[PDB]
Amino acid sequence: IAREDVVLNRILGEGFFGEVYEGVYTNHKGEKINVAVKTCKKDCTLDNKEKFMSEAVIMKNLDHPHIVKLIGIIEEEPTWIIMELYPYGELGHYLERNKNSLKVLTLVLYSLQICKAMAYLESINCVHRDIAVRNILVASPECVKLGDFGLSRYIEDLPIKWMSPESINFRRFTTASDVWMFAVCMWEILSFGKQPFFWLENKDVIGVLEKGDRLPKPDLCPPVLYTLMTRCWDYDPSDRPRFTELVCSLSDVYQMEKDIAM
Numbered sequence: 001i002a003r004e005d006v007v008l009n010r011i012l013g014e015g016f017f018g019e020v021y022e023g024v025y026t027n028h029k030g031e032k033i034n035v036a037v038k039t040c041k042k043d044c045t046l047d048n049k050e051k052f053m054s055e056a057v058i059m060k061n062l063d064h065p066h067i068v069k070l071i072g073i074i075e076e077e078p079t080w081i082i083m084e085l086y087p088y089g090e091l092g093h094y095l096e097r098n099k100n101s102l103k104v105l106t107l108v109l110y111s112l113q114i115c116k117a118m119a120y121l122e123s124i125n126c127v128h129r130d131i132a133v134r135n136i137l138v139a140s141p142e143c144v145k146l147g148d149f150g151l152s153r154y155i156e157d158l159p160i161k162w163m164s165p166e167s168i169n170f171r172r173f174t175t176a177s178d179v180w181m182f183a184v185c186m187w188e189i190l191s192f193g194k195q196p197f198f199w200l201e202n203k204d205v206i207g208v209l210e211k212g213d214r215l216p217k218p219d220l221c222p223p224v225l226y227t228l229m230t231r232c233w234d235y236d237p238s239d240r241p242r243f244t245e246l247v248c249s250l251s252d253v254y255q256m257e258k259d260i261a262m
Contacts, residue, residue, distance in 0.1 A: 001025070001072035006082060012036055016151045017044070017052040025071060025082060035071055038081040049079075051154045056081045058126075058149070066117035068137055068145045086145065088138030092193035095133065099192040104220050105257045110136075110144045111186045111225075112250040117146045118182055119243035122175045129153060129173055131181045132162055133188040160202040161195070165235055168206050176237035179246070183232030190218040190225065209235075224253055 008021040018039035025033045040052040059070040059081075069084040088094055091110065095102065114136060121128055129150025137145045152158075152173070164180035166172035184196050196215055197205055214233050217226040228249055234240050241249070 001074060001082060003074055003076075003080070006035065006037060006074075006080065008037060016154065017041065017048060022085070023082075033071070034085045034087070036083040036085050038083065040079050042078065048154075052079070052081075055149065055154070059083070062120075064117050064120055065143065066113040066145055067120075068147050086137040086139055088140070090134055091136040091138055091144055092133035092188065094138045095189065095193035102192070103261060104190075104222065105254070105261050106141075107189050107220075108222070108225070108250065108254050108257050111189050112247070112254050113144050114146055114185065115182065115243060115246050115250050118178060119247045122178070122243040125175060127153070127173045127175060128178055129181070130159070131178060131185045132159060133185060133193055136185070158202075160205050161197040161200070164237070165206065165209055166237060174237060175243065176240050179232050179240045179243060180237075182243070182246070183229040184215070186225065187215050187218060187229055190221040194218070222253055222257065224249075224256075228253075 005026045006023050007026075008023045010022050012020045012022045014020065015038055018041050020039065021037045023035045023037045025035045027033065038052075038056075040049060053075075056070065056073050059068070060073060063069075068086070071082040071084050073082070074080040095107075114131065118128065118131065128146070129152055130148065131146065135147040137147055139145050150159075150173075158168075160168060162181050162184045164172070164177040166174075167177045167180075187196060188194060197208070200208065214230060217223070228241070228246070232240055232246075
């Protein structure tokens, strides 16, 4: 991709490394595609440059239907990472807007799509750390895509309401802590974008969990899905389901629900 094929139109915001813009990419076929363009401060360390490109290389290579797509990378030295932009926007707002017309089948499907992307990351022992409806983008009513990795992976040695006990307490982040967090995101999806522990302050959260308390069953949540969430919320990471098993349970629930609705 040539720099002249991307035109920047406005500031989108500042991310962890720079300097993120909204732009238009023009295809070799001539199609105009809307894009986000992440940049890295030219006035920054060796190491941040490294990390900003490391992130670009992961997103480039994941190439998963339920992970947000990288369109290209301009390496030369005002570096642009060109990401696909999704005008349906964030899942949480999408679920809010559409609560009155969405069916449970659709929410199970979204949960299943994110689970598959996670099982892929799990296969390569790659920890995402940011599995939340605010960080998932609606490509189409048929397709959701998990967003950017949690930036804490770039900080040398917080979404507290989404995090496992060992993450909060001990800064531990494993595929197992991602499973805990995935189930919170499913809770959000089955609650139409409701924020987890919305009645608590961040400091309250660890106390409630130690006492064995958990997020309640969303009203429209299939019981099977709630007991599945409750297994993900085991204090013991090793007692938690792996994403591969989650993918099988969710597919089973999807096929069950699909028959129910037709």
